[PDB]
C-alpha cells in the first residue's frame, strides 16, 4: 500500500490551514486530497444577517492579501443593483489602490513561493515595500490592511493633502526592488530546476477546470478582465498583459513579475490623471452626507440617521459581478429582495477552483514539486473557505 | 495588447555557445546572486529600535475606544444608539434613562473589545463625536476579562487620551 | 545614506548598479507630517434650484427584468451572444521580455 501523510494544517508550507492528505509511493505523489474548511467561518449566513454597509468589512477578511480589491468587487455589485454611478475621482482612487493592492499581493505570492522553495532573502527585501504600502493604506483609512475604504458609494474619505507625493516617491523606486528580486531568482539554475516544467496544465484543461487569471495566462490564454470587461476607469489606462507559453510554474512566476511592472505603469498613469471633485455619489439616500451638513440641515440629519440605523434599500434582483482580482476572477452573486439586507450573497474565489485542480497538476511529481505547485496557485484560505 | 515573457531563442554561434559553456562550467549567475547578497550586506538595515523608536502613524489611525466630553465636562453621548445599531460585530451594549436633572444619558455603555473589529463605524455614525477610536494600540492584557470595557473604563480612556484625541480630530475633521 | 565612498563603490560593484540613486530608506523627500487644512469641493447636486430629486433618482429607475419567451404565454439567421472578440495586438512598447 501507499504511505498516507498529513501535510498541514500545522506545516510551514501549508499556506495557513490546509489538511493535504497525500498518498505517496516513496516520495512520488500518487494522490492529493485537500481537506479544507479549517477556516470556514460561515461568512455568507452572517452577511445574510447584516445590512449592505455592515457586510462590507467581511470582504476585507475574505482575501486578506488583497483587501481593497474585494471591497471594489462588492461595491460594484451593490452599485449595479442600486442603479447608481460613483464619481470619477472615486473611480480613479479605486483603480490606483487596486493596483497598489495587486503589488502587495504579488509581492506576498512570489516571496512566499520562493520561501517555500528555499529562498528566504527576497521575502525580507520585499516586505519593507509591503510595509510602506501598508502605511499608504493607513494614511488613507486609519488601518494597515482592513481599510473598509471602498464602499458602494465610492470611497469613505478623500485623500490627505500629501499622499500622492509619497505614492510617487515609492513608485519611482519600486522597479529597482523588482530588478533585485529578478536578479536573485530569474536566471538562477536552481530556481529554474525547481520551477521549469513543474505543474504543467494545458489551455483546454485550464478552461474546463474553472481556472482564471495567471493560471490561464501561463498556458497562453489571452484573457484579462481589465481589458475585455473593464469596470471603473480601466478603459482609460494603458498596460500590457503578460502571456506564458509553457504552462508551468516558471512561466507563471515570470507573468507575476511582469504584472508587477505593469501595475507600476498603471499607478504612474493614475497618479498623473487624478481629477478633482467629490469622492462619493451626491445622493444622500445612498451615501451619507458630510458631518457639517448633518449638524446643520434637517434632511441631512434624517438621512444620516436612517442610513446608519436601517440602511439604504436595494431594489430586488440578482447580479453576478466579477473583477480581475490579483489571484484571478473574484465574483459575487448578490440577490436582493427589496429590503436593506441582502437575501443571498455567494462569493466566488479563484483559489477554490485552483485548489480543486491540485490533484490534476501533481500527477507524476514529488513532494517538493507539490510544495512548489501549492505556491504557484497563489492560495489564501480565507477566500477558499469563506 | 499583450507581451510574451518566455519566448526568446539563444544564439548558436561559437561565441555565444562558448559563453554559455563558461556560464555552465564556471557558475556565473550564481556568482551574480552572491554579489547581490554581498551588496545588501553593506547597506544600512531598515530596523527601528522599538520601543525607543516607534512606527509612523496618521491622525486617522483607529485604536482603543474612548468616550469624550464637552469643554464644560458634560458628556457628549446622548444615548441615541446609532453606534449600537451600526456596529457590524454587535460589540456595543447600551442602556439609558432620564438622569436626575432630566438629561438623556446612558446607564450602560459596554464595548466587547474581543468582539470588535476596529472598523470605526461607530465614530462615523455618532452625531456628537462622543465615541472615538483613539490613537493607543499598546493595551494588551493578561486576562480575557480586562478587555470587556464598561462605561467607567471608556470615560477614563477619554479623560486619559483627550489631549491627543482632540488634536487628531482637529487635523482630520475637514475631511469628514 | 551615511556610508563612506569606498563602501558605496563596493555596494555598486557588488550589485552592478548605482544604489545611492534609489535608496530603500526614505530620508527627507516625503511629505511633512503637518499639512494645511483642505477645502474639499461639494458635488453636482448642491444646486439651489432646478434640483428636484425625482430627476436624479437612480434607484427609482430600476425595473423588473424584461421577459423574453415565457412558456406559459423564414429568414431566421443564427445569432451569437455578442460579436466575436477581436484578436489582441502585440505590445508596440515591448513585445518580448
Amino acid at each position: 500500500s501507499n504511505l498516507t501523510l498529513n501535510f498541514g494544517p500545522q506545516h510551514p508550507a501549508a499556506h495557513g490551514v490546509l489538511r493535504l492528505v497525500m498518498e505517496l509511493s516513496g516520495e512520488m505523489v500518487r494522490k492529493c486530497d485537500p481537506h479544507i474548511g479549517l477556516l470556514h467561518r460561515g461568512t455568507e449566513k452572517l452577511i445574510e444577517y447584516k445590512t449592505y454597509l455592515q457586510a462590507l468589512p467581511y470582504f476585507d477578511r475574505l482575501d486578506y492579501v488583497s483587501m481593497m480589491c474585494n471591497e471594489q468587487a462588492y461595491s460594484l455589485a451593490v452599485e449595479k443593483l442600486l442603479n447608481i454611478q460613483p464619481p470619477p475621482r472615486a473611480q480613479w482612487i479605486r483603480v490606483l489602490f487596486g493596483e497598489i493592492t495587486r503589488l502587495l499581493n504579488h509581492i506576498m505570492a512570489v516571496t512566499t513561493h520562493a520561501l517555500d522553495i528555499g529562498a528566504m532573502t527576497p521575502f525580507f527585501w520585499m516586505f519593507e515595500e509591503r510595509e510602506k504600502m501598508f502605511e499608504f493604506y493607513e494614511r488613507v483609512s486609519g488601518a494597515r490592511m482592513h481599510a473598509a475604504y471602498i464602499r458602494p458609494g465610492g470611497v469613505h474619505q478623500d485623500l490627505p493633502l500629501g499622499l500622492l507625493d509619497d505614492i510617487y516617491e515609492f513608485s519611482k523606486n519600486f522597479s529597482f526592488r523588482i530588478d533585485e528580486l529578478e536578479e536573485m531568482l530569474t536566471n538562477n539554475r536552481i530556481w529554474r530546476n525547481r520551477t521549469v516544467d513543474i505543474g504543467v496544465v494545458t489551455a483546454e484543461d485550464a478552461l474546463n477546470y474553472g481556472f482564471s487569471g495567471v493560471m490561464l495566462r501561463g498556458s497562453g490564454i489571452q484573457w484579462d478582465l481589465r481589458k475585455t470587461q473593464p469596470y471603473d476607469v480601466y478603459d482609460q489606462v494603458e498596460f500590457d498583459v503578460p502571456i506564458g507559453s509553457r504552462g508551468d510554474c516558471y512561466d507563471r512566476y515570470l507573468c507575476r513579475v511582469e504584472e508587477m511592472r505593469q501595475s507600476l505603469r498603471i499607478i504612474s498613469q493614475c497618479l498623473n490623471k487624478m481629477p478633482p471633485g467629490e469622492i462619493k455619489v451626491d445622493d444622500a439616500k445612498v451615501s451619507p452626507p458630510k458631518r457639517a451638513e448633518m449638524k446643520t440641515s434637517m434632511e441631512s440629519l434624517i438621512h444620516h440617521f436612517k442610513l446608519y440605523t436601517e440602511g439604504y434599500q436595494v431594489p430586488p434582483g440578482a447580479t453576478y459581478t466579477a473583477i480581475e482580482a490579483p489571484k484571478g476572477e473574484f465574483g459575487v452573486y448578490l440577490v436582493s429582495d427589496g429590503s436593506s439586507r441582502p437575501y443571498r450573497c455567494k462569493i466566488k474565489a479563484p483559489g477554490f477552483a485552483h485548489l480543486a485542480g491540485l490533484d490534476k497538476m501533481s500527477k507524476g511529481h514529488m513532494l517538493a514539486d507539490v510544495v512548489a505547485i501549492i505556491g504557484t496557485q497563489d492560495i489564501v484560505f480565507g477566500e477558499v473557505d469563506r | 495588447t499583450y507581451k510574451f515573457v518566455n519566448m526568446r531563442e539563444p544564439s548558436m554561434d561559437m561565441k555565444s555557445v562558448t559563453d554559455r559553456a563558461a556560464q555552465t562550467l564556471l557558475w556565473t549567475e550564481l556568482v551574480r546572486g552572491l554579489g547581490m547578497t554581498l551588496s545588501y550586506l553593506f547597506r544600512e538595515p531598515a530596523t527601528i529600535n522599538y520601543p525607543f523608536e516607534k512606527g509612523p502613524l496618521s491622525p486617522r489611525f483607529r485604536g482603543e475606544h474612548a468616550l469624550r466630553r464637552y469643554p464644560s465636562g458634560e458628556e457628549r453621548c446622548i444615548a441615541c444608539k446609532l453606534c449600537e445599531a451600526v456596529c457590524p460585530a454587535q460589540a456595543i451594549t447600551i442602556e439609558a434613562e432620564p438622569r436626575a436633572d432630566g438629561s438623556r444619558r446612558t446607564t450602560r455603555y459596554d464595548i466587547d473589545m474581543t468582539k470588535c473589529i476596529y472598523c470605526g463605524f461607530c465614530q462615523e455614525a455618532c452625531p456628537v463625536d462622543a465615541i472615538v477610536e483613539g490613537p493607543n494600540f499598546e493595551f494588551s492584557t493578561e486576562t480575557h476579562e480586562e478587555l470587556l470595557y464598561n462605561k467607567e473604563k471608556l470615560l477614563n480612556n477619554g479623560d486619559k487620551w483627550e489631549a491627543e484625541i482632540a488634536a487628531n480630530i482637529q487635523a482630520d475633521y475637514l475631511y469628514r | 545614506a551615511s556610508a563612506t565612498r569606498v563602501i558605496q563603490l563596493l555596494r555598486n560593484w557588488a550589485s552592478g548598479r548605482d544604489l545611492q540613486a534609489k535608496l530603500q530608506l526614505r530620508y527627507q523627500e516625503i511629505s511633512k507630517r503637518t499639512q494645511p487644512p483642505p477645502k474639499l469641493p461639494v458635488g453636482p447636486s448642491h444646486k439651489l434650484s432646478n434640483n428636484y430629486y425625482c430627476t436624479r433618482d437612480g434607484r427609482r429607475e430600476a425595473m423588473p427584468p424584461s421577459i423574453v419567451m415565457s412558456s406559459q404565454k423564414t429568414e431566421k439567421k443564427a445569432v451569437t451572444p455578442a460579436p466575436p472578440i477581436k484578436r489582441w495586438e502585440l505590445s508596440k512598447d515591448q513585445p518580448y521580455l
Binding site: 513608485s171 523588482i178 536578479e183 499607478i267 | - | -
Partner: peptide
C-alpha cells in the same frame, strides 16, 4: 470661501517612472 484645495498632482505632472526590467550584462567573454 477660499479656493478649493484638494490633493492633486503638481502643475504639469510627475516625473517619469521606470518599470522595465534592467539586468546589465556585466561580464567577461
Amino acid at each position: 470661501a477660499s479656493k478649493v484645495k484638494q490633493d492633486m498632482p503638481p502643475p504639469g505632472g510627475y516625473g517619469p517612472i521606470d518599470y522595465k526590467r534592467n539586468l546589465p550584462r556585466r561580464g567577461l567573454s
